[PDB]
Design a protein around this nucleic acid. Structure first.
Lengths: 37, 130, 174, 226, 180, 136, 134
RNA sequence: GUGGUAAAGGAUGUGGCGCCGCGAAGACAGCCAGGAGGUUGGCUUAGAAGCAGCCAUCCUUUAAAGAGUGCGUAAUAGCUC
């Protein structure tokens, strides 16, 4: 689920991501595709 | 910020209300069960601060806190700073010791102690339990 | 204090070299990447890096410095290794000696010949692993040999190392 | 034929004393204040392996389940003996398939039914421009009103549309509606007149008000019943 | 407690250059012994923050003067927040203007019952009092519920009492929820 | 809606810069250099508001509805002298003070303010108690 | 004998089936009919939360005796109180006479590891963030 | 590959800037054993006696004091913190 936007730490505690220039967040749960990219 | 003040003054006093020192480093068994040690002091005397486990540097050299003439025991592990003077050290100390052997993986390890003032030898401590 | 404190035993043959320091070990002779602006004092053989400065690039370089080199001596202290273990009711394995085994595609010329410092260990009908000079590509080819059919968000069948507590949610139920 | 899955009839006891009066889903429209449907039930008496109750006790509440009297046989192993009263028809839908899945199709069941006096159920109906529609509505018990609303109600669209009126056939279950389920001449005077467009736009617009009204029937029932 | 460092320049140019510096426009007034001394940000801004301030009187420190002073008119930006230009008055002889502070601690007559909240009234009183002035002027009230609210019949002021605003105009207010 | 009993039938236009001020009640918001905002949206605020403050935490709303707009009739062509009506807005330019006191306390507003912040067609800003004012 | 397992609950109740039933059940319980020997306790003592707790074994032994509580419910025995039926906390008298909980307790300090110093004057107040003698 | 015609809002982008958590009787971690000792619900009691739908507003220890963040159903476990 590459959402276009928002993203605000929804597997509760969650890691900001920086890779390929692209910037995301992954935590413990796959049901948390916060790729606003 | 959090320096030589409250939270680190009255803790000296049970060691200083008289001076019959006692100590322990045990905390290797669950607190839910470790209270058997914590409650042992009433059987060992009366609600004594045996096995308080006071903080290192905040009590690992508590003589530094308030001139206890050097409590040279073992900095290893936590320091109970057990207040035997607060209770009634005698043969009563054995109640706080024998319970610590049979229970847990040593529910109460032997440590440095000092009745009245001057420290007893650590090797002689087990003999002093009676 | 903690950014560069490495004891470095074995009688290690580590010494700074133009981008690539020397190694010896079980069979060791390895070279490691560097960017020279760092350099490390290695008198006797110490690891005790000198930072070129202290801006964030270098200081993140400070770890790439340390760490890569850090295991690099540890790795040749032995035939460096990661524990590993597939399990699941339907599969098999066999060290062969000179073929990879495995059975989970289930029509299965599975084997790819092992690369270099790689060497397999057949411990238990299910607990195979790997060892060798490397850590990283040992972290890879293993993951690669792991890479074939990994998961099973349900019944266990998963190829694993020691394995994280495998996440478990019901199929149709339970 | 068509397997309408369930077809429970139940027993109605209209006030003023009218006995069963031949309960049904189309036996005498609602003339007087219902007596709360009322019917029987079936207790829970079927062994089970391991701890599968977790899934049963949960889904079992399919109809205000009532722990008749939980039990646990001894000497056995995991096998339990749960008990809970319920209805008849209800235990005919989304039950069998579950009875197995819930416990992995382990153990069976057997009861004799039970329960009477009260028991919600109401009579969820539907709406379709016309009225009375085909012949649905039964007894929406436990929010069962909208439960199937977005399901049966949204009957696709009767497969057939008939005309371009777009009648809105809602679900007059008993409200207060619930469920929520033309030539192209306009563009021909091209390139201009957001005026004359409107002129010919009203012409047909008037028909709708004179169509749905005069155009009696407009009932395309006997489709699929789903 | 605060100081300032003076600037001869006034009106137009210079402060903006110092507004850029964050060095700030300022006022010394003395019952027509006026002067324009010029402030600077942050700290005296921290001084602004002191709550009792713009009320409880303050004392600037030009090289020598030890004069306590009061706030009143203050310029205020709208190209953002953060004020344009604060102004001042040291006491002279007969203090008069006295917009006296309030942080009311009335009894929660309503929240445990009707759930109405104690919606604020004046924030702070305007009451004359020469040099005998408390931090927290106070008015307890037990009739506080619903929407209609009691008026300031009874200020009960400290030593330097006066109804200097106007003879009583409401004490406070409470907001009704659903005409409960 | 929120307007009535008009003096006229259609204002003219302008927009350049203006001035509001201090908060009333130590919770509030403010913005930038707004274009006009429709009343629904204006009312939508409080509408958006009501659910969230303990689904009941009472709050004063804010600025009053203003100017007329219309596409005359619809999308024919100019020919109208300029008339007809539907929607109303606010004078909105220095970043007007938004009104948000309640006692409903803390973040519950503050993110509802973000709700509000995410709401409304202008970047804004967040405010509370600061530095008084005074009037005769 | 040493097959005991975790299983805490209340009692004084005549009907084990709704509560005590899936505990050791297939888990390892045997027999039923504890109610007759609940009478060995539930005729009087045990209204203070006083669990047996039984033990594991081939059979079900019996229901006999009951071990004494830690409890926030023991030291305040002399009523079972009365507040809390309609929405825990809030109004409904937070208070009825200061000794009432201490006078009825005092002897509160039964089972625990070794020994706490006093059930009454020097410990009661803490079970009221555990409840409301506060 | 920013120059390279775009908003909204995301963004531990990064830069330096002032404001506030250094507690060298030494921290926030990252670690490791504890992770509460009378800390157990009157309203569900289908169990909650934190860890579904129902109060947290006083003591015992001080190792700290989780009124208890957590995964959930026979309470509960059992892993966090």
């Amino acid at each position: 689920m590459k959402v276009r936007a928002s993203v605000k730490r929804i597997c509760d505690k969650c890691k900001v991501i920086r890779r390929h220039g692209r910037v995301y967040v992954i935590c413990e749960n796959p049901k948390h595709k916060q790729r606003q990219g | 910020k959090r320096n030589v003040e409250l939270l680190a003054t009255l803790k000296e006093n049970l060691e200083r209300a008289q001076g019959s020192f006692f100590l322990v480093n045990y905390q290797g068994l669950p607190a839910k069960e470790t209270h058997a040690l914590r409650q042992a002091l009433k059987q060992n005397g009366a609600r004594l601060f045996v096995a308080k486990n006071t903080l290192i540097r905040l009590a690992l050299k508590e003589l530094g806190l308030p001139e206890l003439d050097g409590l040279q025991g073992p900095s290893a592990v936590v320091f109970y700073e057990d207040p035997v003077a607060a209770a009634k050290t005698l043969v009563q100390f054995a109640k706080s010791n024998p319970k610590g052997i049979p229970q847990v993986k040593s529910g109460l390890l032997q440590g440095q102690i000092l009745t009245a003032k001057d420290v007893e030898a650590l090797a002689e401590l087990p003999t002093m339990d009676e | 204090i903690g950014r560069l404190p490495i004891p470095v035993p074995k009688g290690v043959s580590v010494e700074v070299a133009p981008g690539r320091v020397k190694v010896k070990g079980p069979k060791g002779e390895l070279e490691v990447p560097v960017s020279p602006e760092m350099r490390v004092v290695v008198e006797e053989g110490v690891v005790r890096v000198e930072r070129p400065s202290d801006e964030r690039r270098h200081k993140s370089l400070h770890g790439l410095t340390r760490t890569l080199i850090a295991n690099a001596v540890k790795g040749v202290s032995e035939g460096y290794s990661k524990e590993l273990l597939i399990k699941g009711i339907g599969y098999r394995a066999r060290l062969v000696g000179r073929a990879l085994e495995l059975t989970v595609g289930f029509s299965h010329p599975v084997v790819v010949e092992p690369p270099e410092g790689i060497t397999f260990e057949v411990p238990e009908p299910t607990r195979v692993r790997v060892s060798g000079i490397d850590k990283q590509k040992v972290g890879q080819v293993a993951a690669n040999i792991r890479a074939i059919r990994k998961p099973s968000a349900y019944h266990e069948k998963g190829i694993y190392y020691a394995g994280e507590p495998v996440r478990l949610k019901p199929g149709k139920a339970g | 034929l068509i397997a309408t899955a369930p077809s429970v009839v139940y027993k109605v006891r209209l006030k003023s004393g009218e006995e069963v009066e031949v309960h049904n889903p189309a036996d005498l429209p609602d003339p007087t204040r219902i007596e709360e449907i009322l019917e029987p039930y079936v207790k829970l008496t079927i062994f089970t392996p391991e701890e599968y109750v977790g899934s049963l006790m949960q889904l079992l509440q399919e109809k205000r389940g009532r722990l008749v009297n939980m039990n646990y046989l001894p000497g056995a192993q995991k096998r339990v003996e749960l008990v809970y009263e319920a209805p008849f028809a209800e235990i005919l839908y989304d039950f069998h398939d579950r009875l197995k899945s819930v416990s992995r199709g382990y153990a069976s069941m057997d009861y004799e039914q039970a329960g009477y006096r009260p028991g919600d159920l109401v009579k969820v109906n539907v709406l379709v421009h016309g009225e009375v529609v085909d012949a649905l509505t039964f007894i929406a018990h436990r929010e069962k009103a909208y439960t199937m609303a977005r399901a049966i109600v949204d009957k696709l669209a009767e497969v057939i549309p008939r005309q371009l009126f777009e009648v809105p056939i809602q679900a007059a279950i008993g409200g207060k509606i619930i469920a929520r389920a033309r030539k192209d001449v306009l563009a021909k005077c091209y390139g201009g007149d957001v005026t004359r467009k409107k002129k010919l736009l009203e012409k047909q617009k008037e028909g709708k008000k004179r169509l749905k009204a005069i155009g009696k029937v407009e009932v395309p029932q006997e489709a699929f019943l789903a | 407690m605060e100081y300032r460092l003076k600037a001869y320049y006034r009106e137009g140019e210079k402060p903006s250059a110092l507004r850029r510096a964050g060095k700030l426009p300022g006022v010394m007034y003395n019952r027509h012994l006026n002067r324009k001394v010029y402030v600077d940000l942050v700290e005296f801004d921290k001084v602004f923050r002191q709550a009792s301030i713009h009320h409880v009187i303050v004392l600037e420190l030009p090289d020598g003067q030890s004069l306590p002073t009061l706030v009143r008119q203050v310029n205020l930006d709208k190209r953002r927040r953060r004020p344009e230009h604060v102004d001042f008055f040291v006491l002279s002889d007969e203090p008069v203007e006295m917009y006296v502070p309030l942080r009311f601690v009335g009894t929660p007559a309503g929240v445990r019952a009707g759930g109405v909240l104690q919606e604020i009234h004046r924030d702070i009183l305007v009451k004359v009092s020469p040099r005998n002035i408390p931090e927290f002027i106070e008015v307890d009230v037990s009739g506080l519920e619903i929407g209609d609210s009691l008026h300031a019949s009874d200020l009960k002021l400290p030593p330097g009492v006066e109804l200097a605003v106007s003879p009583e105009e409401t004490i406070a207010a409470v907001v009704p929820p659903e005409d409960v | 809606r929120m307007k009535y009993r008009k003096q006229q039938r259609g204002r003219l236009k302008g927009a350049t810069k203006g001035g509001d001020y201090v908060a009333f009640g130590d919770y509030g918001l403010v913005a930038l250099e707004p274009a006009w905002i429709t009343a629904q949206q204006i009312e939508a605020a409080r509408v958006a508001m009501v659910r969230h403050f303990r689904r009941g935490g009472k709050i004063f709303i804010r600025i009053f509805p203003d100017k007329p707009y219309t596409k005359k009739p619809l999308e024919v062509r100019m020919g109208k002298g300029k008339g007809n009506v539907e929607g109303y807005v606010a004078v909105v330019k220095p970043g007007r003070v938004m009104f948000e006191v309640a006692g409903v306390t803390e973040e519950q507003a503050m993110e509802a303010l973000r709700i509000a912040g995410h709401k409304l067609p202008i970047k804004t800003k967040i405010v509370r108690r600061d530095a008084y004012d005074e009037a005769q | 004998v040493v097959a005991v397992v975790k299983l805490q609950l209340p009692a004084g109740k005549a009907t084990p089936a709704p509560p005590v039933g899936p505990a050791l059940g297939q888990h390892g319980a045997n027999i039923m009919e504890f109610v007759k020997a609940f009478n060995a306790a539930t005729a009087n003592m045990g209204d203070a939360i006083v669990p047996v707790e039984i033990t594991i074994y081939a059979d079900r032994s019996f229901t006999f005796v009951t071990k004494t509580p830690p409890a926030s419910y023991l030291i305040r025995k002399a009523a079972g109180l009365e507040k809390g039926a309609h929405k825990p906390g809030r109004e409904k008298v937070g208070r009825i006479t200061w000794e009432q909980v201490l006078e009825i307790a005092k002897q509160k300090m039964p089972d625990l590891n070794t020994t706490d110093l006093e059930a009454a004057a020097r410990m009661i107040a803490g079970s009221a963030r555990s409840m409301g003698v506060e």
